[PDB]
Ligand binder design. Structure first.
Ligand code: UM2
Ligand code: CL
Length: 427
């Protein structure tokens, strides 16, 4: 009967869903590529225990008498029970197991999940042959963000190992959503809110219109880059003294500048929206997206653009609690944004007690234009996903753009002292 408050991010998704109530545009997902055999019966039991201990995966969303949303907690069965289902799809024998799995996930992601039914996720274990497996985690964005996907996978594996070893299942170690929401409420009521509002509105008084090279589920094209191609990003990071994600952001900024010739470029950057220890370990949806405005002047080196990114990010991080969707509402119209550049944080390979799982993105969220999603590291290799609004980009277009970008990025990283407007951008 308890009516739980939504996080700001959840409020955002809720409002956006209302614009297209039967749509699936806020269906997101990821998967684990697993290099050895798993026991589906045991993993199915592990999923049940994992979900049972994950409040957000046992939640539904309802409206009160004033039409305002709230979250309701619905434990699984030993008031609706959260259902738990791990599908087993044996593609061992198929001509193209990987392709069939992708097709299955794409069709699942296209399936609407009504918010008033608890358990807003979809789970499938694929057998691919050669003993390889794929675990698909499909969710409604309102219950799970990128950070929480990692929290889920780690817990799932932990429970699976215990059930496999005969060991007692370790207690879950998640945080509390109500306290996380209370933290946001405290922020909104604080003096910092006013200061943040002033900071962000001040930066965009000219209200630059978003430029491309409504929010819809993306067409996704993925490019695998081995370490031979990606190590150079690490070397650029070492040389500039900037974290490699900053090098990538600078690369996107330079790419946009070189393509369009535009002085002032905007990219959008996600931040976790998690403040404090409790928030960091609470599965849910709290992520924020903020505009990074960058001036790329004539004759600047790539290293100089990295510095420009670092300066802008310092300000973004210092005012990161202000909601991106709030900034847009105040500026009006289409708001302010560029391609979303999402360099996912490091995730250790997921240990299933022998078999190891490597995470890859399936769909990070809907977009009005483009998301650029990276998983991996310079040393281990990268998966680069270009997620394009289907009314803007065709699949082939995204493939071409993504290869062009990675080539330019690699050239920049190979010599940060080079002048950006002298670096050849090849079509
Ligand atoms: C305003 C909150 C909904 C948008 N969030 C996302 O789609 C993130 C960036 N994946
Ligand atoms: Cl997210």
């Amino acid at each position: 009967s308890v009516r739980h408050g939504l996080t700001s991010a959840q409020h955002c998704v809720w409002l956006a869903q209302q614009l297209d109530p039967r749509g699936a545009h806020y269906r997101t997902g990821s998967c684990l590529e697993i290099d050895g055999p798993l026991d589906h019966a045991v993993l199915s039991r592990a999923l049940r225990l994992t979900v049972a201990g994950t409040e957000t995966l046992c939640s539904r969303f309802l409206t009160d008498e004033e039409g305002r949303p709230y979250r309701a907690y619905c434990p699984p069965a030993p008031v609706p029970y959260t259902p738990v289902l791990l599908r087993h799809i044996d593609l061992s024998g198929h001509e193209d197991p990987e392709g069939e799995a992708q097709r299955w996930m794409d069709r699942d992601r296209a399936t609407p999940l009504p918010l008033d039914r608890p358990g807003l996720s979809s789970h499938a274990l694929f057998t691919l042959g050669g003993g390889r497996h794929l675990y698909y985690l499909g969710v409604h964005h309102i219950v799970i963000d990128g950070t929480s996907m990692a929290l889920f996978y780690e817990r799932l594996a932990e429970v699976y190992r215990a059930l496999r070893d005969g060991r007692a299942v370790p207690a879950a170690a998640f945080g509390d959503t109500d306290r996380m929401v209370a933290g946001e409420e405290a922020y909104r009521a604080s003096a910092r809110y006013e200061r943040d509002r002033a900071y962000w509105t001040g930066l965009f008084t000219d209200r630059p219109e978003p430029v491309s090279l409504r929010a819809l589920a993306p067409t996704v094209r993925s490019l695998g880059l081995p370490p031979e191609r990606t190590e150079v990003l690490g070397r650029a990071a070492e040389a500039t003294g900037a974290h490699w994600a900053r090098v990538v952001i600078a690369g996107v900024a330079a790419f946009l500048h070189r393509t369009t010739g535009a002085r002032d470029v905007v990219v959008s950057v996600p931040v976790t929206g998690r403040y404090g220890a409790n928030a960091r370990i609470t599965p849910g949806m709290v992520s924020n997206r903020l505009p990074l405005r960058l001036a790329v002047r004539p004759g600047e080196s790539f290293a100089r653009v990295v510095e420009t990114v670092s300066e802008a990010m310092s300000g973004l991080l210092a005012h990161s609690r202000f909601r991106g969707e709030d900034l847009d509402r105040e500026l009006g119209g289409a708001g302010v944004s560029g391609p979303t550049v999402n360099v996912m944080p490091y995730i250790r390979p997921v240990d299933f007690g022998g078999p190891v799982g490597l995470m890859r993105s399936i769909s990070s969220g809907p977009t009005t234009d483009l998301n650029i999603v990276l998983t991996g590291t310079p040393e281990s290799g990268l998966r680069v996903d270009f997620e394009g609004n289907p009314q803007v980009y065709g699949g082939q277009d995204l493939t071409v753009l993504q290869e062009r970008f990675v080539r330019f990025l690699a050239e920049l990283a190979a010599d940060p002292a080079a002048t950006v407007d002298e670096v050849a951008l090849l079509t």
